[PDB]
Amino acid sequence: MRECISIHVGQAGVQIGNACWELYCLEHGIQPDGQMPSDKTIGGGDDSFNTFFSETGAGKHVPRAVFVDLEPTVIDEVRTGTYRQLFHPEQLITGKEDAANNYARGHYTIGKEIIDLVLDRIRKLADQCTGLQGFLVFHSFGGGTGSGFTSLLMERLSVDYGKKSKLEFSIYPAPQVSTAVVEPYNSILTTHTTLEHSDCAFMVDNEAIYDICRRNLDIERPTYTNLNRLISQIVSSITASLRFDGALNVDLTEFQTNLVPYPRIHFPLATYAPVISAEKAYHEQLSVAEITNACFEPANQMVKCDPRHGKYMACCLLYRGDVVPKDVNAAIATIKTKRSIQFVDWCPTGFKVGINYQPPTVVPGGDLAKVQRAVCMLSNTTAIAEAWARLDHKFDLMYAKRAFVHWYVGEGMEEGEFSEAREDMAALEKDYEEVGVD
Amino acid sequence: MREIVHIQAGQCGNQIGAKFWEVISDEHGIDPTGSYHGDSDLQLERINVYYNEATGNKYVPRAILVDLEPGTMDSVRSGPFGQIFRPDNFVFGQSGAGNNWAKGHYTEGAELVDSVLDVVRKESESCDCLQGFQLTHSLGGGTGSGMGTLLISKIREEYPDRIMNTFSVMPSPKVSDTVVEPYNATLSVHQLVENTDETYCIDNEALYDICFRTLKLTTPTYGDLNHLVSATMSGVTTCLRFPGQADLRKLAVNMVPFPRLHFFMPGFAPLTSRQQYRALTVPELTQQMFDSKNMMAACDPRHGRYLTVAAIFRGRMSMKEVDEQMLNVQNKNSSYFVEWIPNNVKTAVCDIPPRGLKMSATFIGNSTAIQELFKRISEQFTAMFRRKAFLHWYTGEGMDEMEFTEAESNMNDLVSEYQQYQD
Amino acid sequence: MYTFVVRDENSSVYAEVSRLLLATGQWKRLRKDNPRFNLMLGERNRLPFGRLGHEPGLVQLVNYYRGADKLCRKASLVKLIKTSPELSESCTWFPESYVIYPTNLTDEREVFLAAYNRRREGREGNVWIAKSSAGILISSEASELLDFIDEQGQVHVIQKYLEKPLLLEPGHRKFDIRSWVLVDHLYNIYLYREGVLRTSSEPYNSANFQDKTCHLTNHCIQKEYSKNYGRYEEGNEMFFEEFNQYLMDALNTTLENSILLQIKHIIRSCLMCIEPAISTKHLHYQSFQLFGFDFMVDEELKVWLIEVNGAPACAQKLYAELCQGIVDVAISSVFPLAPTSIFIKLHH
């Protein structure tokens, strides 16, 4: 067993973390007070779930997580919520005034004064690890803390834990659930200084989750609770291989090996199904084929883009529930004859499959219905570069007028960091087109 | 725990400031004696943004009342909520400013500013994390205009990293009959341009036309003008006073793309005088809120372009239909929004409506059409200054003419600056 | 009030559609760099599809299908037909073609040479034609076709030159047929009832392929290098009503039976083949596109597909009607306004 530490940064990073760990306890049968009656190795153990939970002599199962926010309102909730007892106070870190949606303020100004403290709280969790694998960092692109302090942490972690993998879960900004105008700036600033430090990052476009909630869950005005409950399901599907007995994606290193052939092209697309509303009278359960085919509908992807016009470098099917390999291959063969799935020449045309018999766990009182089988497809498509195109375009429109730039210069950032970061994104978009186009 | 220190200076500053505390006090369930008697926890969740908590569960506004003459402030202390303000926080002189910016900024005001700053320092020293300050004042008189800007320049020296936000009443020949007004306004605009982060332009010209044309008030009074300022001030601060998504610096980061262009056009719907029975539909809130007749800057937005816009809807209403109507105004008049600032229109919804309204809407616009406001003042200013008329009132207090030329140039540059982004 | 932008000032087709839309008082035009648009008349090259469909509350439509180049490229069309079981390498309406890359650079050189020697050995007509999307050569010697391609630096397609084309009389002259096909967002395949014949005003001469004027029916080669331009018909353009009467008086048949059936079959087969790849049925934005199909008719009244144009222009006499039809079924059908259709739906 090898532990994984999660780091939740900013509002979106912390509220999503609160949704994942809620689900982790339900899937592993851990109670809100940290008790896990199923673990017969009281006081410890080297089981698969221990990769995410430490154990105390009292039998409490404590998440291996650190919550970081430059403002206390969002983490105070976790200090008085249902699972308040899961975390000890040292695990929750809060400042007093936030980054004001200003990347520079989060990276330079406020980040400088709190960087060495977060790293010291992390060291306290790593000391409890007999064999640390790496980190999963949750954050948003848009916020001043999620973008600005995260990149600062990623640079520091690479220095203090060189041989350790670092996966990201990043929230791509969507105007429909955002009131900040400068998020394109922040999104690009953080991707520039974090890119060399991230080994694999799963982007989630809030626009994608927002429509899945309105379309599949019949939620007129989706709240952050609606969004984070769904996002945690996808996260749970992606992290299941590290928390359960199995052979696919057993450790963080296996993600970059199976999904990232090129270091810079490390942004896999995620597709999840089925998403069924609990308010339905009663749904006709979908078959292995029906849900496998759904992984190629753009309406189920965590980012809207057309993989028919990109090329695949890797494809990974993660099933949960009543699923046997025979039906998987049957659905796959049917989809190849009907779908346009183009792999890059220097890659094999194949799929890695993972099957976990326990079907997806639903949160009581949530919006998702209990289903007999679900799947999450992880595909490294060059089609995800469409997200960088949109992001870079909005950046260019504003930067041509230097709109809002003075807010960043005022925090100590040089204007050159803008164009420096933008040139990098230009190189990223070129790297994608080199791979997926002829 | 993001506290705001409120300052109101001068006749207009205190009369409008007093109404503000009266209005929001009613929304947060605080009575004239500071005791809480509300029924919604949502009233107290962000109450400490503008109020302090005293023994016995008393809520005392975090407000400093400043004037150079006791006249107006005795009115406040004898007003409805007069007994709610902190007694010490009353700082006043005995000479007045005689509608003379110089007297407020250099002579009569300097004799008093240090004591006003001892109260500011006292109030800030009790804040866990101070957002910044907000000032209510007029620009046409002597105290709010002259001493108000002196307070800003000194506060900014003592709290250089805190946000400065002002509600500033622009003078109109339709409300005031004092000839020196353009002089006092031009001098003040020079200061605001340099030393404030956000300034709401409350044009008495617009307030007058609304009361006379729309509301049909034949003989508008300041009570009628300040009814519209109350509703607007309540509207623009809703994001700060109730649990929403909120921060003075965050508002600024999204409203102000260029440091000098921090003058907002406020708007409100429905415009009402002191007989609202019929429910106002969401489409009605949106049309009025964006129509010029509901603007409070006396600038036809169709003459300029919106750099950023922010809308606040209050009450229990279809949040889905709000998006529809809002996106309909943009996609039906996107020629009035700059295209080089994506998604520059943002909207929030609050569930607690103002008193006596099923639902209202507040409009916060950073429009380049605000230049018409500054052009108006500049025309009036230069008409007198080219003849050096009425300068002796000012040169007698130690000012030179060059100081007028500089304030004139700073404002005409501001107009030129607004005009370039409009193309 | 709908909105639209214009990003191809060179499109004579959508210049009229843009002029018509504005004439409805219900369509407002915005700057080309303006994102809040309902309809995009996009550029030809590098149209930014990745940016479409991400404006909250705006249903956006574009006049191009992403991936349609696979059908409108000389080399792409050849590859699509051979590698697609729907069409199959045995497709009987497409001239035997080969994708040849210049030797300064998969490639079908050795494969193209195999069938060539087969004909030369079988006393069969071995007159090919070399061309590219970017200069056309008609020769019955293979060495001339390959050397010509090597002298160029781009891909070339060599296909069998129809040595027995249907010659109109009088004139003993070649011709081709342009059919304008419109595909709406729902993927209905509509065929404009009106087509044109781009005839060669020069008598076809099977003993001189150097004089490519009686062989290449291009309106630009006829109005330039041809000296009988406009003699038999106006602008070397013959419409269906006349071409139909000719077949009745000369061959005792009609255009619908002898030619149009095959044409409507070729169109369906092509667009139906690439439908899984380009359909916008479940996409966050919608697409339509006007296509220009070019056919050859041989003496046996068999129809062949020459190429498929992605940004086709229209005959002068048919601009008004067709452009109006684009607004009825392709634009207004998605943004309705406050017949006897001119199209023929090819049900599938």
Add this chain to the structure above:
Amino acid sequence: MEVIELNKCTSGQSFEVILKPPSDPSLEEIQKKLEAAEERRKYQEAELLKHLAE
């Protein structure tokens, strides 16, 4: 259409199907970036206080 590396266990199984074959800054350098940005803010605030002093 070939399956390979079938792994079975109590909680599930995994396998691979192949359809077709193919064809940092130091701790010191970060401290300087942070302190350089801090100095620029000090210079900017100094010039502001100089302005206010005049």
